[PDB]
Amino acid sequence: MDEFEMIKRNTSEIISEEELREVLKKDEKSAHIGFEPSGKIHLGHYLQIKKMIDLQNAGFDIGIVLADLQAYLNQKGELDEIRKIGDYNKKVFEAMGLKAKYVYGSEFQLDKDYTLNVYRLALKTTLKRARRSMELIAREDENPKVAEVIYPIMQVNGGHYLGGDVAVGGMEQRKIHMLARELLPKKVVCIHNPVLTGLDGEGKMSSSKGNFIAVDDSPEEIRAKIKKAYCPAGVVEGNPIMEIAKYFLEYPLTIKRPEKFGGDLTVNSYEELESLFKNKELHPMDLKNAVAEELIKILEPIRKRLLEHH
Amino acid sequence: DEFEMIKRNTSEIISEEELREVLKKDEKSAHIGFEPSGKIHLGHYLQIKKMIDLQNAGFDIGIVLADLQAYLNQKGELDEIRKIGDYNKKVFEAMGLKAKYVYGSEFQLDKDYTLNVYRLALKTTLKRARRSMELIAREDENPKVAEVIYPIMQVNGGHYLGGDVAVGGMEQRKIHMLARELLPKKVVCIHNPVLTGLDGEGKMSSSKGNFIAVDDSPEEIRAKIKKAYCPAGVVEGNPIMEIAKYFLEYPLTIKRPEKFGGDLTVNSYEELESLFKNKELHPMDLKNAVAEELIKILEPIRKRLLEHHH
């Protein structure tokens, strides 16, 4: 498919599609994403890195912000420990095939002129707006800290310093991105990716909740996690197994079954799989088994590349 | 002794026992911060007088022209705020203060400073920060993120300054108690009273225009005092009695006709309070004495400031 449709595929929104099309005409163009460093790199990370790879394949220069200062403000621990996790994340992203340049937020988010602009943004940003933009990002705290409202203006100014053509993030970033769109002059094209459902179906996938498949999980860990995963028959919305099939698997997809239960099945698209499951022609245990074996193979080159370092 | 001179006309010392230990040192320092003010009024003068007390006790005095705090508190642009701070420095010098001056922005934007601000932001709840600013923050229907950065900015300012004593008005007491809670070194805090506004309506402040400026013309001083709140017998919230307590010299002679026994001569504010509570001294006699003595007290300050126009 053409570069626009490749970038648009499996995204939740593009703000705006018209301006992205204009960006694609340029010979030099850049896209950035930030990640708070995470002890485990899970399928949620992988979904976004795949989107960055789409962009690199469309001729964008990719920048990855290892967001150590934001993680610090978000009570994730001490800076030098966060940065060491950031280094490991960089290796994992490389193992995924990403071709990017990497920087720690702290390399530029602590100089005088940056800090003065954070304070200028602080004068323009209401507390109510800052908290609302952090609702899905802030780590749980019964006594919310000042650091929670510095976080979004820290991030907004980061996008300002980076000065790319495109900013990518999950839908939980949407309010911060729209805050930047109204505090800053220079407008970036925003691409927002969906946020995956946790494996037990209770809320979204997140590193703190341990409700995820990590890209370096063992094949039997993946099988076991999918076995116990929430996957009610006929139910597609909020079904994590259907999400993995939508966002990671390749089509045509073959689902093996005993002929006692209809024999092997071949699905040409995710939509065909959707109605198959909605009409209950496909049992969850047969969905799970095929999702698990195909996912294992997709993650194998990543896991292998990381294991050969030992 | 030095302790009693320092304590005189203060509202509290946190703590007296610590101050007594600080007085045992050959070398000791004390600092105070001022958001630059377009007029310098009796509230400022009261605090500068206390700094002069400390200097006379062997303290090295540091004055922070708190431009970045004023910036965060919506007082305008930094360039203009610094120009007002320069003007304030000249008024404080005309008061007789031997002090070193510094703009907060000279050190409050360094990377290690900003990093410790963010470290303090992790430790300070939003509720605590907002409560600490109740008497300081500019009124705002939609409170900004800058409001909760201000107190931790000020807390870290004392940490960097490393003085033995911090001086301020009673409106500062919550920020200072937050500092003593959060910082590894507890600084002695000397808090001066906040004066009552001329109409008795509330506290005196620059934003409410209910003050006497130290360079007000004698005619203006007389007009302000004449209209001031001063009910016979009432001492609390009486700004005219406050001026007699904090600025006038004793023994102090109240001119009235021999029709009323003098030329009532009083050698303590306590004896003045006795006569006024007893309704032996009419507010009009009190006002006329307070005005003419206050004019004489402020005259050398106003004269030194008027000389600057060649």
UniProtKB/Swiss-Prot annotation, chain B:
Binding positions for L-tyrosine per the UniProt entry: H31, E35, Q172
Motif 'KMSKS' region: positions: 203-207
EC number: 6.1.1.1
Chemical reaction(s) catalysed: tRNA(Tyr) + L-tyrosine + ATP = L-tyrosyl-tRNA(Tyr) + AMP + diphosphate + H(+)
Name listed for the protein in its UniProt record: Tyrosine--tRNA ligase
Region (Tyrosine): 150-157
GO CC entries: cytoplasm
Region of interest (Interaction with t-RNA), residue spans: 227-230, 282-287
Function: Catalyzes the attachment of tyrosine to tRNA(Tyr) in a two-step reaction: tyrosine is first activated by ATP to form Tyr-AMP and then transferred to the acceptor end of tRNA(Tyr).
CDD domains: TyrRS_core
Signal sequence bounds: none
